[PDB]
């Protein structure tokens, strides 16, 4: 069990950008953070990937 | 080209474009030649036009 006051921990979020040559996507929300989602298209692999980060 | 579905390697075959080329040439020269003397020209020749330039 844990018994904190307010001050005690500290939380801080910073969504990252996209940038110039990424195909502009999306942004989602999680407990009220704001995620930055991103596609890629591999042709090497013939399939897209997807990355959602903070 | 043609893969399977769902094959584990994703490799494709790099399709080439390659045009080809030949070449025409100028070969030959066509001529008729004549040569008269001048007592031909004066005396046998009577139309230059029917008798030499359309033969």
Redesign the interface.
């Known amino acids: 069990a844990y018994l904190w006051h307010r001050t005690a921990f500290i939380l801080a979020y910073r969504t990252p950008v996209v940038p110039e040559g990424a195909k502009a996507g999306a942004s989602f929300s999680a407990n009220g953070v704001a995620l930055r989602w991103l596609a890629d298209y591999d042709y ?4 897209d990937r997807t990355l959602l980060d903070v | 080209n043609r893969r399977d579905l769902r094959d584990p390697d ?1 490799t ?1 075959i790099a399709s080439e474009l390659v045009e080809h080329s030949f070449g025409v040439t100028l070969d030959k020269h066509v001529y008729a030649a004549l040569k008269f003397t001048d007592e031909q020209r004066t005396l046998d020749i009577r139309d230059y036009t029917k008798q030499v330039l359309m033969p």
């Open positions: 090497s692999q013939l399939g | 994703r494709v």
